[PDB]
């Protein structure tokens, strides 16, 4: 489970800060478990891609 | 980490109307998104990954 997320095999969703700029966007821009999306009560589908490696480790930090 | 898991506070995409803020769906035409399980997301993902 530590070697798995090194390969990126654990698709743990990155958290959307909601108060600090990130690499979020819409569904279409995800391409350029693919990405994790939210529908805020005052916004469109905000989608942030899972990291290609250390997704679980990056989430835990 | 499993108590952190049974509370569903780590979102793992299992492997569509959408929904720091926890993302509530994982998406791959229209935007089709599978919801993340409320509790034991990592456990269910591992159970399906080996099955």
């Amino acid at each position, epitope marked *: 489970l530590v070697l798995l997320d090194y390969q990126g095999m654990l698709p743990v969703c990155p958290l959307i800060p909601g*108060s600090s700029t990130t690499s*979020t966007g*819409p569904c*279409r821009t995800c391409m350029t478990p693919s990405c994790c999306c939210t529908k805020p009560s005052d*916004g*469109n589908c*905000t989608c942030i891609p899972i990291p290609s490696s250390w997704a679980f480790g990056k989430f835990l930090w | 980490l499993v108590l952190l898991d049974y509370q569903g506070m780590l979102p793992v995409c299992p492997l569509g109307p959408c929904r720091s803020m926890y993302p509530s769906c994982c998406c791959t035409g229209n935007c089709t998104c599978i919801p993340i399980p409320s509790s034991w997301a990592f456990g269910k993902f591992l159970w399906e990954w080996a099955s």
Partner: antibody, heavy 123, light 107 residues
Framework: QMRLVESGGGCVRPGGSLRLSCAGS????????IHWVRQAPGKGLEWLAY????????YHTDSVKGRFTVSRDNAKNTAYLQMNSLRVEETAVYFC????????????????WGQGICVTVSP | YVLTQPPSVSVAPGQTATITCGGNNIGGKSVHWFQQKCGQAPLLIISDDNDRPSGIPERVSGSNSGNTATLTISRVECGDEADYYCQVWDTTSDQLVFGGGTMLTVL
């Protein structure tokens, strides 16, 4: 509901300056980046600037780069666009529109538009 | 990044309208469609090239593929007369680009 109000427009001399405040309400102003668009009196929409959900990334058009400068204050729930060295062909209707995505570095698309404040520039 | 869009489209009450804005690589970009009636602020009617917001009539449907992205309004009322604007974030130069606007006419 979600509603943006622009302020600070009006007649200015050719070469003057303005700061269009943009008071947003009904939404979490801290989580969405604010665009700034202008529409000439009878022509199409023209993007003017964008500022991220906190202020880290700010983008400008090439025709306004080095003259216009976006800014914001999430505590006051406002967004500003300092427009310096305003030219004659700069008269338009300026809108501030919130981006539709939380904490995005790029303004992929507006969600709620402002009312639009009419800025005129003439002697 | 030029976003070509027809200057005008004329339809009849009951027929359908197709406003097709086209870029070089518009298939790899998030096309948003806004509606602006005369003397009013533009209104987002299509997002993510197809996601219709809340309150927008279901007759409105966007599309995006290849070099062109189209907005189709089916069974247009006389109240659909407006200017419809494409909008994409050009990531190569990091600038938002609007189309030329298509003045819909519903006779």
């Amino acid at each position: 509901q979600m509603r943006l109000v622009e302020s600070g427009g009006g007649c200015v001399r050719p070469g003057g300056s303005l700061r269009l405040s943009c008071a947003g309400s009904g939404f979490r102003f801290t989580g969405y980046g604010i665009h700034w668009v202008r529409q000439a009196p009878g022509k199409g929409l023209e993007w003017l600037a964008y500022i991220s959900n906190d202020g880290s990334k700010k983008y400008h058009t090439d025709s306004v780069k080095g003259r216009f400068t976006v800014s914001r204050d999430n505590a006051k729930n406002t967004a500003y666009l300092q427009m310096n060295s305003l030219r004659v062909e700069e008269t338009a209707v300026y809108f501030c529109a919130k981006d539709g995505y939380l904490s995005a570095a790029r303004g992929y698309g507006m969600d709620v538009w402002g009312q639009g404040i009419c800025v005129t520039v003439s002697p | 990044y030029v976003l070509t869009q027809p200057p005008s489209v004329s339809v009849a009450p009951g027929q359908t309208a197709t406003i097709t804005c086209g870029g070089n690589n518009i298939g790899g970009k998030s096309v948003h469609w806004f509606q602006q009636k005369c003397g009013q602020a533009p209104l987002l009617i299509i997002s993510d090239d197809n996601d219709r917001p809340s309150g927008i009539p279901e007759r409105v449907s966007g599309s995006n593929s290849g070099n062109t992205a189209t907005l189709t309004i089916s069974r247009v009322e006389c109240g659909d007369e407006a200017d419809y604007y494409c909008q994409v974030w050009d990531t190569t130069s990091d600038q938002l680009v609007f189309g030329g606007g298509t003045m819909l006419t519903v006779l």
